[PDB]
Coordinates of C-alpha atoms and ligand atoms in Angstrom, one line a residue:
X4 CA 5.4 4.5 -20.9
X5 CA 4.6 0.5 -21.7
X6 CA 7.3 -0.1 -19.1
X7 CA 5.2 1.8 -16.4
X8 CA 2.4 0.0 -16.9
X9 CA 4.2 -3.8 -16.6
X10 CA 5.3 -2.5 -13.5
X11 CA 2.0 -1.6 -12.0
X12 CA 0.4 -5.1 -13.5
X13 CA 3.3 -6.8 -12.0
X14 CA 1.8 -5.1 -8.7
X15 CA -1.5 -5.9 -9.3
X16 CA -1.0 -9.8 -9.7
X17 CA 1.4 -10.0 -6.7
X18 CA -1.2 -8.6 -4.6
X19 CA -3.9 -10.7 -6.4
X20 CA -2.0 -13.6 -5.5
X21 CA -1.6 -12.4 -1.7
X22 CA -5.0 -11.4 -1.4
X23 CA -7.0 -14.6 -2.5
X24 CA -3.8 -16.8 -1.1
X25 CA -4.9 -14.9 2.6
X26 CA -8.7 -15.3 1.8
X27 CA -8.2 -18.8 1.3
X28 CA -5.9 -19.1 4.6
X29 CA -8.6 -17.2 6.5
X30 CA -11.6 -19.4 5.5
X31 CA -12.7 -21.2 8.2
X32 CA -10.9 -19.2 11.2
X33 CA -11.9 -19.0 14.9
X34 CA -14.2 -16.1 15.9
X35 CA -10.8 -14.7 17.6
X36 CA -8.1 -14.8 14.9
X37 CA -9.7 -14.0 11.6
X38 CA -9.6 -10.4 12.3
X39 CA -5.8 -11.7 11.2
X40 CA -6.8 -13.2 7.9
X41 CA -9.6 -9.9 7.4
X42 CA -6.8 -7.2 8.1
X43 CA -4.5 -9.1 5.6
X44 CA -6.9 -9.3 3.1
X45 CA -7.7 -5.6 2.8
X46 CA -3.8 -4.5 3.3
X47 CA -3.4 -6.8 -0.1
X48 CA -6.6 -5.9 -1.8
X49 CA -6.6 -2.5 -1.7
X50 CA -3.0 -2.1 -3.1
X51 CA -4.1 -4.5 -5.7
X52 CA -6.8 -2.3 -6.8
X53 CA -4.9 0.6 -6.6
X54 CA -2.0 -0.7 -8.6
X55 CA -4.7 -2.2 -11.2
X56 CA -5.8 1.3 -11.7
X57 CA -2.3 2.5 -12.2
X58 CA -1.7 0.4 -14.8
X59 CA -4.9 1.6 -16.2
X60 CA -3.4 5.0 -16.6
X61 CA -5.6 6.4 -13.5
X62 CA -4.1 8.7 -11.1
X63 CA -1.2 9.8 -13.1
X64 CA -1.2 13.7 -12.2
X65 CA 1.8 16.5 -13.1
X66 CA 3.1 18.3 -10.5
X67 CA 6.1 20.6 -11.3
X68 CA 8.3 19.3 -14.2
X69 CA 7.0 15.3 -12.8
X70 CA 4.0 13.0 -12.3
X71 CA 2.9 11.7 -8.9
X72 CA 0.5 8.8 -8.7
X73 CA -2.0 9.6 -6.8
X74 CA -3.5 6.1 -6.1
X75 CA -0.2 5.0 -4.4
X76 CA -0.5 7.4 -1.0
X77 CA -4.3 6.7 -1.0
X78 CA -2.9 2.8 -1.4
X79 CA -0.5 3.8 1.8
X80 CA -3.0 5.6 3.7
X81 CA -5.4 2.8 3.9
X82 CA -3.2 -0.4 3.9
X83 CA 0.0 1.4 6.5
X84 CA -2.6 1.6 9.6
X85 CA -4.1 -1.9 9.2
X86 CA -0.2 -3.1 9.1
X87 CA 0.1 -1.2 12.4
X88 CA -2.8 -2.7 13.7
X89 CA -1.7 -6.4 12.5
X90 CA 1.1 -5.6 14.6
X91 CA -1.0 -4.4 17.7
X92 CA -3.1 -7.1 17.7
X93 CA 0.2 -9.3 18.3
X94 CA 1.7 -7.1 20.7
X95 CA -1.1 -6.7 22.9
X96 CA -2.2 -2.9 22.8
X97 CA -5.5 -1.8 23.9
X98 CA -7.3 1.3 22.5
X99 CA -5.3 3.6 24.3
X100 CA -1.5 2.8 22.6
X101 CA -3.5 1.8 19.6
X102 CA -4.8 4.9 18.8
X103 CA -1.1 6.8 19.3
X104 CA 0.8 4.5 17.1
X105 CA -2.3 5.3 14.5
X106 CA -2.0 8.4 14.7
X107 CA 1.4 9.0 14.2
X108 CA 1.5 6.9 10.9
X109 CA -1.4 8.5 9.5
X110 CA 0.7 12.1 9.9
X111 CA 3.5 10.4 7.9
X112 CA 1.3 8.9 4.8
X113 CA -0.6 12.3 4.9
X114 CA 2.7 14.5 5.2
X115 CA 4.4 12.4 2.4
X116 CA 1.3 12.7 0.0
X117 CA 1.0 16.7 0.7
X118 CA 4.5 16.7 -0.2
X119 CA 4.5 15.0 -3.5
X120 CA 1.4 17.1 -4.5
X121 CA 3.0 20.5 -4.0
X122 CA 5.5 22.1 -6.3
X123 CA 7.6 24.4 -4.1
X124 CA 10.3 24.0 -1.9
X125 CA 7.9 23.9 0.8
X126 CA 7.5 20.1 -0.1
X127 CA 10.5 19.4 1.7
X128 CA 8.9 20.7 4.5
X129 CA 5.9 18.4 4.6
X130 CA 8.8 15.6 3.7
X131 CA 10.3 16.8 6.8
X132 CA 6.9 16.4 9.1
X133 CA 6.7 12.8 7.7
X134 CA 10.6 12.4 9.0
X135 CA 10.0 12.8 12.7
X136 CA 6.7 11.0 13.0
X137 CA 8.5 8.1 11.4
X138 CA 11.0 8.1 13.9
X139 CA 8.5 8.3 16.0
X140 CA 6.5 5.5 14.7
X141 CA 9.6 3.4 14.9
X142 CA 10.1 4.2 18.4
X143 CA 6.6 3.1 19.8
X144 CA 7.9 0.1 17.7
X145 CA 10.8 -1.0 18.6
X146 CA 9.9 0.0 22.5
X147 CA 6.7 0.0 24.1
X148 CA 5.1 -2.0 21.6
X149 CA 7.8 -4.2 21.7
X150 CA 7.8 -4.8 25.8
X151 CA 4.3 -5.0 25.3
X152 CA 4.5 -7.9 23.1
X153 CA 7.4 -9.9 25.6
X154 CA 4.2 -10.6 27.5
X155 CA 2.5 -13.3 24.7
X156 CA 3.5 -16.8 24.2
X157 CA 7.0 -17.3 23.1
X158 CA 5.5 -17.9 19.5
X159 CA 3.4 -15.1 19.0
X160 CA 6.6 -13.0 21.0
X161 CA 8.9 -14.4 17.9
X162 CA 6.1 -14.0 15.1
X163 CA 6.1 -10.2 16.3
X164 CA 9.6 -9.9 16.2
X165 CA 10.1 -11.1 13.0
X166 CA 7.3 -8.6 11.2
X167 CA 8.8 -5.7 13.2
X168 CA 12.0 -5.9 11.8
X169 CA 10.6 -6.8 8.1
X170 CA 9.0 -3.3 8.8
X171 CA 10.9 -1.3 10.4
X172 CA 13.6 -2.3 7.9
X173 CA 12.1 -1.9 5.0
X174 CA 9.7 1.0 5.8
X175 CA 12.6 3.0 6.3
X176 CA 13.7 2.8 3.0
X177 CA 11.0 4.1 1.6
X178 CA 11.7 8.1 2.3
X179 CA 14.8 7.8 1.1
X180 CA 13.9 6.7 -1.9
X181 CA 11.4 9.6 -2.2
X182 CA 13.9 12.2 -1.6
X183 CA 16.1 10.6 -4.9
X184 CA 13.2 10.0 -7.0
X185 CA 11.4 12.4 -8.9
X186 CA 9.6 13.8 -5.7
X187 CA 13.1 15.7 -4.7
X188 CA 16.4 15.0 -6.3
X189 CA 14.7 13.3 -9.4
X190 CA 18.2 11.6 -9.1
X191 CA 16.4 8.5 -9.5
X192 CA 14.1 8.0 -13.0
X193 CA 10.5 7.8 -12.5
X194 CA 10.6 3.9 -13.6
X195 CA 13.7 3.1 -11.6
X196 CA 11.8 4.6 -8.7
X197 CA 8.4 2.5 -9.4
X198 CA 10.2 -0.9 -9.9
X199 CA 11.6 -0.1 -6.4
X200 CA 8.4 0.4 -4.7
X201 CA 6.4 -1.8 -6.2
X202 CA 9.2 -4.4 -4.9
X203 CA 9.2 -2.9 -1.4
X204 CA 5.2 -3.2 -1.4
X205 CA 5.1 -6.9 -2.2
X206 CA 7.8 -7.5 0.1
X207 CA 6.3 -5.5 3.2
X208 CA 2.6 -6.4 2.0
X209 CA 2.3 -10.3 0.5
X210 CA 5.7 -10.7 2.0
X211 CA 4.3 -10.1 5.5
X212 CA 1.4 -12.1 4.8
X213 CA 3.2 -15.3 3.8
X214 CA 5.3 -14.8 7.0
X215 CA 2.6 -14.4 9.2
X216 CA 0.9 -17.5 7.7
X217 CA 3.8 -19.7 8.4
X218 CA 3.3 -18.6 11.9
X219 CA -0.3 -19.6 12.2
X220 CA 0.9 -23.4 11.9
Ligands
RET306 C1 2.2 -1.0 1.6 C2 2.9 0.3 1.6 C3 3.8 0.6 2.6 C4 4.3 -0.3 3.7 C5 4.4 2.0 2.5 C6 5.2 2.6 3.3 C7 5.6 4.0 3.1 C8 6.5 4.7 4.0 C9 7.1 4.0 5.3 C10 6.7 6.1 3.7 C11 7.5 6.9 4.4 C12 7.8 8.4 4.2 C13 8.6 9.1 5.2 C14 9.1 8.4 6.5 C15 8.9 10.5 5.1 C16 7.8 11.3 4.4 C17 7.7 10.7 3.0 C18 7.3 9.2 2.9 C19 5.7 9.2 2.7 C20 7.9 8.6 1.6
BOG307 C1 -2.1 -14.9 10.5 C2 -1.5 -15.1 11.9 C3 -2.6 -15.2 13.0 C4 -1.9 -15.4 14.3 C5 -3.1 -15.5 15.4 C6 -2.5 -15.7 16.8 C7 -3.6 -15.8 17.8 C8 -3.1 -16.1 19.2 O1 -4.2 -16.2 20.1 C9 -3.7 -16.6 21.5 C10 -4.6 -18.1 23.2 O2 -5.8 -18.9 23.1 C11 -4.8 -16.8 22.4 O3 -4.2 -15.9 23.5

């Protein structure tokens, strides 16, 4: 499919953009913030790679009676903790709540990628481990993480608030649409379902970026 390809190029250059936009932001930057511009840099260039290799035609494995694209949860592995982190940084957290909110989104990305990669019913079962870490995740999120950042200036307290709800919003769209694309239901066409993510990516990747750089100023 030419249109599955477009749409992974289309990834690729939005995350090009983001990346070398961030570098750019981060040269120059105080030996106490560009762990900022560093963490935003590899969230956007690792997607960008892997959606560069997509479009290549790497990755693209059959399952049952569908194709899962591998280099998309190995994307989501790698770039969803440094988000997490980006977001500890602000609120506050120290190893110990760090490494819980971790954690609990690595089980997620790992769940959702066992999932997709088995053809049995038993999928839904790894979907379903993925579902209560998430509302998990959220949790640590919206709460503790969220008290934790009430103690920072009143613009990093904003600046967090703003990215959490970005996230939280947006990341929990993103199961839902596995369980109607091809993954579960398939009652969403393997294209549909790409152009969606690869929206949802940008957005919750570059997007956050951007965001975060208006904040710096
Ligand atoms: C840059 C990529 C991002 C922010 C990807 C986010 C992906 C998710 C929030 C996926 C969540 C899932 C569940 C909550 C249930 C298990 C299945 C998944 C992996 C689709
Ligand atoms: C890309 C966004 C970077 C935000 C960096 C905020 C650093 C706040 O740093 C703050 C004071 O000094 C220090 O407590």
């Amino acid at each position: 499919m030419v249109g599955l390809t477009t749409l992974f190029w289309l990834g690729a250059i939005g995350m090009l953009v983001g990346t070398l936009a961030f570098a750019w932001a981060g040269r120059d930057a105080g030996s106490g913030e560009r762990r900022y511009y560093v963490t935003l840099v590899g969230i956007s260039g690792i997607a960008a790679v892997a959606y560069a290799v997509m479009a290549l035609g790497v990755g693209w494995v059959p399952v049952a009676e569908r194709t899962v694209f591998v280099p998309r949860y190995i994307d989501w592995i790698l770039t969803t903790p440094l988000i997490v982190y980006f977001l500890g940084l602000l609120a506050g957290l120290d190893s110990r709540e760090f490494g819980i909110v971790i954690t609990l989104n690595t089980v997620v990305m790992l769940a959702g990628f066992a999932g997709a990669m088995v053809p049995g019913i038993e999928r839904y079962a790894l979907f379903g481990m993925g579902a209560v870490a998430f509302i998990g995740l959220v949790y640590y999120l919206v709460g503790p993480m969220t008290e934790s950042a009430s103690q920072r200036s009143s613009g990093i307290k904003s600046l967090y608030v703003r990215l959490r709800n970005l996230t939280v919003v947006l990341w929990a769209i993103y199961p839902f649409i596995w369980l109607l694309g091809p993954p579960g239901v398939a009652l969403l066409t393997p294209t549909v379902d790409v152009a969606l993510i690869v929206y949802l990516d940008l957005v919750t990747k570059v997007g956050f970026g951007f965001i975060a750089l208006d904040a710096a100023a």
